[PDB]
Design an enzyme around this catalytic site. Sequence first.
Site, short mmCIF file in Angstrom:
data_model
loop_
_atom_site.label_atom_id
_atom_site.label_comp_id
_atom_site.label_asym_id
_atom_site.label_seq_id
_atom_site.Cartn_x
_atom_site.Cartn_y
_atom_site.Cartn_z
N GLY A 97 -61.59 -85.40 -36.73
CA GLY A 97 -62.28 -86.09 -36.60
C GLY A 97 -62.49 -87.57 -36.63
N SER A 138 -65.53 -86.68 -37.85
CA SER A 138 -64.90 -86.11 -39.33
C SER A 138 -66.22 -85.63 -39.77
CB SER A 138 -64.64 -86.93 -40.07
OG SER A 138 -63.99 -86.64 -40.94
N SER A 189 -58.97 -83.14 -42.36
CA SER A 189 -57.98 -82.78 -41.69
C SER A 189 -57.12 -84.07 -41.50
CB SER A 189 -57.58 -81.54 -40.63
OG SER A 189 -58.82 -81.08 -40.83
N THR A 221 -62.51 -77.70 -37.96
CA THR A 221 -61.38 -76.71 -39.20
C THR A 221 -61.57 -75.33 -39.08
OG1 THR A 221 -60.75 -78.32 -39.85
CG2 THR A 221 -60.12 -76.72 -41.40
N1 LIG Z 1 -70.34 -73.46 -39.80
C1 LIG Z 1 -70.03 -73.58 -40.70
N2 LIG Z 1 -71.03 -72.57 -41.98
C2 LIG Z 1 -70.40 -72.62 -42.55
N3 LIG Z 1 -69.99 -74.07 -43.37
C3 LIG Z 1 -69.68 -74.97 -42.46
C4 LIG Z 1 -69.46 -74.86 -41.23
N4 LIG Z 1 -68.60 -76.09 -40.61
C5 LIG Z 1 -68.75 -76.32 -41.01
N5 LIG Z 1 -69.54 -76.53 -42.70
C6 LIG Z 1 -69.34 -77.09 -43.48
O1 LIG Z 1 -68.73 -77.88 -43.44
C7 LIG Z 1 -67.59 -78.98 -44.22
C8 LIG Z 1 -66.89 -79.56 -43.55
O2 LIG Z 1 -66.43 -79.11 -41.93
P1 LIG Z 1 -65.33 -78.60 -41.67
O3 LIG Z 1 -64.59 -78.04 -40.96
O4 LIG Z 1 -64.22 -79.25 -42.76
O5 LIG Z 1 -65.13 -80.25 -40.92
P2 LIG Z 1 -63.70 -81.06 -39.58
O6 LIG Z 1 -62.66 -80.49 -39.66
O7 LIG Z 1 -65.02 -81.26 -37.92
O8 LIG Z 1 -63.35 -82.33 -39.93
C9 LIG Z 1 -66.34 -77.46 -44.62
O9 LIG Z 1 -66.01 -77.56 -45.07
C10 LIG Z 1 -67.76 -76.66 -44.83
O10 LIG Z 1 -68.44 -76.14 -46.09
F1 BEF Z 2 -62.72 -84.42 -41.47
BE1 BEF Z 2 -62.47 -83.36 -40.33
F2 BEF Z 2 -61.05 -82.76 -40.52
F3 BEF Z 2 -62.18 -83.65 -38.76
MG LIG Z 3 -60.89 -80.39 -40.56
#
Ligand SMILES: Nc1ncnc2c1ncn2[C@@H]1O[C@H](COP(=O)(O)OP(=O)(O)O)[C@@H](O)[C@H]1O
Ligand code: BEF
Ligand SMILES: [Mg+2]
Length: 711
Positions: free
Chosen positions: A419, A147, A200, A152
């Site tokens: 995650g 997470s 998510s 995403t």
């Molecule tokens: N490649 C990226 N460039 C810019 N910001 C990013 C990037 N990847 C993640 N982030 C930042 O980290 C936060 C968490 O990422 P997210 O994709 O929502 O994580 P996951 O879905 O793996 O839980 C995003 O809201 C953004 O602020």
């Molecule tokens: F919290 Be991330 F969407 F895995």
């Molecule tokens: Mg996510």
Amino acid sequence: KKDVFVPDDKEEFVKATILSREGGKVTAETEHGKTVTVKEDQVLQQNPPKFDKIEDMAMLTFLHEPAVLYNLKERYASWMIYTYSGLFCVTINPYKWLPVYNAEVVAAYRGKKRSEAPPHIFSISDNAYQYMLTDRENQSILITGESGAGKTVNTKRVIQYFAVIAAIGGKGTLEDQIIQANPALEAFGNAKTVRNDNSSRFGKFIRIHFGATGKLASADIETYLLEKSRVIFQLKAERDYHIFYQILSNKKPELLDMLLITNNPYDYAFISQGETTVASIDDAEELMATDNAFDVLGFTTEEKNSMYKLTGAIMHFGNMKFKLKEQAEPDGTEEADKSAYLMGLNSADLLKGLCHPRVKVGNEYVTKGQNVQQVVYAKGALAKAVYERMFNWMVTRINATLETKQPRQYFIGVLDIAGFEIFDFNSFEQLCINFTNEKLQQFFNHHMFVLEQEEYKKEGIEWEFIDFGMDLQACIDLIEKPMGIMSILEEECMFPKATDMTFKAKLFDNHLGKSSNFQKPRKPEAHFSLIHYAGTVDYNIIGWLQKNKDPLNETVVDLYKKSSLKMLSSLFANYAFQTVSALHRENLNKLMTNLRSTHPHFVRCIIPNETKSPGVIDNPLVMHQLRCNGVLEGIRICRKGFPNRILYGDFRQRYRILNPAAIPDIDSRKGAEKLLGSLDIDHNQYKFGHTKVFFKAGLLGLLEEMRDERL
Ligand SMILES: Nc1ncnc2c1ncn2[C@@H]1O[C@H](COP(=O)(O)OP(=O)(O)O)[C@@H](O)[C@H]1O
Ligand code: BEF
Ligand SMILES: [Mg+2]
Ligand SMILES: CC(C)n1c(=O)cc(N[C@@H](C)c2ccccc2)[nH]c1=O
């Protein structure tokens, strides 16, 4: 020689210079100015300065844990967030906007081969697109991580790449609509947790359909187990789903007057148990983005208003009070009136159904009594069911618009799961989430280490099996096989006398001291711990039987079915048997068999630290992620094995131009042999199989450079 890596208690590994050697021990001066003595076998060689910030870690002279960690750290320090690791990619969350995702960048990545461009999500997207058209087969982009790691964001960048490529070649085009699907799903399916401000709370698999020559044709979305419980419950440092706060922002005053709500989230019990504002989120701006997404996806005014009304009715449902005179009765009716008005129901009928549900006795019935605790539990369960069913309607409605009827040949599926996470309190939903992550890791292990070696064996390629220590079968079986955790929960289900403690005693009797991955736990109270691939998680089992059965007061479900609000009656139309864990296992197994029929492309997102800090690396946190992901072993098999292979017929067709004079050869294997032998290449970089020619890491790229030159 002198330039090495040594182990360190705080930073895992540090750079050092060997000062002396004696008795199996090495004396070295570290980069941080510490003079250290360590055993010889603990000393690892530094790669030459020419391999600094290398784009593909499979090309390193020395492959070991600090070589990978430091290569990734050095690239990250320069804001180079993607790195190739053999055939797959690793990415480290920058926690800041970088100028790497613009339209000039998408245009420059189009049709570029892996080596002629820097590592990027656009190149992973483009390479899957080139395999799809060349091999004529479906592809998958499987984005792993804990997470907050960036799954995403990386998923939205894959979608953006193909929609912008299609833009060059409802109330918007297909391209505009695929992009708007995520803002709409995120308002209802995402929320602020401790690890991610935009976590998510459901998994998703997005299929992007393409015609024979690669034109964007259509898209479809499948979602998995939404975390229903968040609708009515929050821990201390978390929020309910975004939408509640987006509405309350008062950015649309008409919404507040239509839902009969105030501007204060603290006036609503269901949504204010934890936090109500997030510094990184402008809920007013987010409301606009959500409302616009529904328009672009061609939702009607009546469809949008109904989703808003049901969201508002869930808010009033949580404010319904009950008291005694053990039988419960309503302690007021104002909140009940507001809900029923928004849900097209009768207030007095709803309260009667809640306090006095009926038990079926054949074609007759017996009234059942309810204490206050029973009513507030049932009122909570109904609110969760309305929400999850409304979320499912929205996914179905988005899919109706994304379905064009334009010609389809292949797809590229992008998987974005919830995650791996560890909270202070971990319940049934955390087990469901973490289990998916364990399954996704095992899919990676099976593809990279099992199927890969089996391919060499069945093809007659001379190979010695390597045990990579990447096998999660033991923990997976503990959770999913008969007499495992879910199997025990499912069996304790539909047992009238079963309680949370009988379920707990059955878990302990079957697995404590018997299943290696099952342990007793160590701050809220926990009942059992589970050794997952990414860490030990302490689980609290209170309410798991009720959560798995998911019972509903069928008297008020009947009223939902007879609702004057069309959306509500449609949501409960087909309502009538499987437990939520049995359905989750079934859907997960189905996903894994479907992914096995695709060419997978793995993207490993890494969270750099626990504080959302841009550019700062927590070395043990990063090393732990690389370890449990199998990054090193994944690179080893690419270096040691034959990552590329082509059927003899396809080989002679594609690479004849390299030397047409060599094949002026009926048998495609005879043709492939003579063609390859006539070229200026290392004749040890390839091996002949029964049906395919196998290539060492780098030979396919070279053959492709040579072909691009002849064209
Ligand atoms: N490649 C990226 N460039 C810019 N910001 C990013 C990037 N990847 C993640 N982030 C930042 O980290 C936060 C968490 O990422 P997210 O994709 O929502 O994580 P996951 O879905 O793996 O839980 C995003 O809201 C953004 O602020
Ligand atoms: F919290 Be991330 F969407 F895995
Ligand atoms: Mg996510
Ligand atoms: C990853 C691997 C198993 N692989 C290959 O090693 C080669 C493939 N096909 C050849 C014909 C190709 C060459 C250039 C671009 C796309 C595809 N397919 C493959 O899936």
